[PDB]
Design a protein around this ligand. Sequence first.
Ligand code: HEM
Ligand SMILES: Cc1ccc(C(C)C)c(O)c1
Length: 137
Amino acid sequence: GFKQDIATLRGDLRTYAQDIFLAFLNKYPDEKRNFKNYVGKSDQELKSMAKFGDHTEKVFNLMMEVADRATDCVPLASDASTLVQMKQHSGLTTGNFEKLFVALVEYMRASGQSFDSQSWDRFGKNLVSALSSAGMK
Ligand code: HEM
Ligand SMILES: Cc1ccc(C(C)C)c(O)c1
């Protein structure tokens, strides 16, 4: 389930983070605009860019935290508060997040692995709910 899937991703977090976030940029090619540094670059090029690797790690380090802290795939409001409030998410909207989570769940469903994709889908949904309620557009 959800809790074991957090353990699984935390076991190879570097590589799960880059692959899922890459799955997101390729499914929604328009999302690369938030990351102009990432335009006209192949996945293998992106994974050799210092900020690509480090920022994607920091994203998933935090993602997993919020996941870890959730009850029944419902994140804390305080963690909703943090994401919305972050300076680096000034120009973001909940649709950005939904897409990250469509890809992630798609990624898990196409994996060979027994990820609890149902959980992550709720979790994605419930984070978007909670970003709305904390004031994300
Ligand atoms: C659960 C979801 C997410 C978490 C936990 C998260 C976390 C973070 C963190 C920790 C940073 C700062 C890292 C750093 O500057 O070193 C950051 C920056 C940023 N995030 Fe997010 N983020 C999330 C979702 C998103 C989504 C969906 C987008 C865009 C669609 C996005 C776009 C950005 C951008 C553009 C920055 C600043 C530029 C950059 O980091 O290279 N984030 N986020
Ligand atoms: C927050 C965040 C997420 C992902 C990336 C790419 C490396 C994929 C960033 O630069 C920043």
